[PDB]
Amino acid sequence: AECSIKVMCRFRPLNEAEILRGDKFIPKFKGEETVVIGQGKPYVFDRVLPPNTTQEQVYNACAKQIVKDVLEGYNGTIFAYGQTSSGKTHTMEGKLHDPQLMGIIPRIAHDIFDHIYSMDENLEFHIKVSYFEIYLDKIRDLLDVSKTNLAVHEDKNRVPYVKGCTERFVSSPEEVMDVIDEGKANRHVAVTNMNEHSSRSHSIFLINIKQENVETEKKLSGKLYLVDLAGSEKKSLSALGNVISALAEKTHVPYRDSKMTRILQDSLGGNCRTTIVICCSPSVFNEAETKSTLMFGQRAKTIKNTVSVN
């Protein structure tokens, strides 16, 4: 199909420190896709999502489609890039069990299933999730703490994948939920210590959705990544950063710079529908990063992917 990588920009509101430290709101929103910082040039994306916009609405805006797609046969990835404290974890997962405050992952959980349940008796679906976080170029099963430093490979079709990953099976959004809760717990067994730990730790949630209609025996499938990157502020980022920057404009892409990269390789260069949610801060306290981030999203919006079924 050859469709572009969508990019959305979500701005948190101002925090206490900022609110109390006076500060002020930098971004100016014109149209429903363009943002403006102070005097400078105007940044334009697939959608811009100010503070006031709900998570529900954030969802319909970025995830909702990616989900219908995976169920059609294509792969999908939706990650959140941005400097620490910007909103990534709130937008990717949110308050897990609040029907209002819950982020994307859980909502996708519900959407996937709401969708399946409704389909015909034929074509059964095999959904298996896996969960793991990266830290210093090396992996770590979130569902099996014992294991750390697992590694990647190229399938039959010769494309990469984390191997030896504890793939759990789910039949309802609830399971998917439990599974996430497991991880977040299995994490809490860790000393360096949490807030710190994350900070530079990207967590990956994989949802491998496979279906076959039994009657016609025609199959389908797709991997749907829900990455929540760690801070971007000034090492895999750089890997990432280049891996795309080498995509804006015959060049050769250094996927191999980092596993991560090596992982979402098909999400940046492969038959895969991809969206990016860049989270930003409105306080001038970070006007810098704001430029790099935006700039980062900007570059991405250019990169076009070729995506096919099966």
- 210 known member of a binding site: no
Is 304 annotated as belonging to a binding site? no
Domain CATH code at residue 118:
3.40.850.10
Q: Which DSSP symbol is given to 111?
A: H
Of 107, 98, 124, 89, residue with least CA distance to 224:
107
**For residues 253 and 266, what is the distance between their CA atoms, to the nearest angstrom?**
12
Q: Is 88 annotated as a binding residue?
A: yes
Compute the 3-state secondary structure of the chain and give helix, strand, coil in percent, each to the nearest 5. Answer: 35, 30, 35
What is the maximal distance between C-alpha atoms in the chain?
65
Is 235 one of the annotated binding-site residues?
no
Q: Could you tell me which residues come within 8 angstroms of residue 16 by beta carbon, excluding any fewer than 6 positions away? A: none
Q: How far is it, in rounded angstroms, from Cα 232 to Cα 202?
A: 11
Q: Are 303 and 247 in contact (CB under 8 A)?
A: yes
68 assigned binding-site residue: no
SS3 state of residue 162: strand
> 124 φ, ψ to 5°?
-85, 160
Which helix or strand (DSSP H or E) is residue 220 part of?
strand 219-228
Pair 140, 148: CB distance under 8 Å: yes
Residue 86 lies in domain: 1-310
Question: What are the CA-CA distances from residue 244 to residues 25, 252, 264, 306, 308 (Å)?
Answer: 30, 11, 11, 15, 21
Specify the experimental method.
X-ray
CB-neighbour burial class of residue 262 (10 A; exposed 0-12, middle 13-18, buried 19+): buried
Encoded tokens for 26: 């930098």
Cα-based distances in Å from 91 to 7, 59, 129, 149, 150: 14, 9, 20, 27, 28
83 is in an annotated binding site: yes
The rounded radius of gyration (Å) of the Cα atoms in the chain is 19
275: nearest Cα among 73, 74, 126: 74
Distance CA 16, CA 283 (A): 11
Note the residue count of the chain.
310
CA distance 53 to 49: 6
CA–CA distance, 88 with 265 (Å, rounded to integer): 21
- Output the six-digit token pair for 204: 């990956």
Q: Distance of CA 239 to CAs 94, 143, 203, Å?
A: 27, 26, 16
Give the 3-state secondary structure of residue 52: coil
Which letter does DSSP use for residue 84 in this model?
T
211 annotated as a binding-site residue: no
Domain count, the chain: 1
Name the nearest CA neighbour of 26 among 47, 16, 12. 12
Tell me if 180 sits within 8 A of 96, measured CB to CB. yes
102: CB partners within 8 A, 6+ apart? 55, 93, 94, 95, 96
Residues 6+ apart with CB under 8 A from 191: none
- What CA–CA distance (Å, rounded) separates 277 from 82? 8
Is 130 annotated to bind ligand? no
Q: Are strands 76-81 and 219-228 parallel, antiparallel or unpaired?
A: parallel
Residue type, 122: N
* Separation of alpha carbons 166 and 269, rounded Å: 26
Helices (H), 119-215: 173-188, 195-198
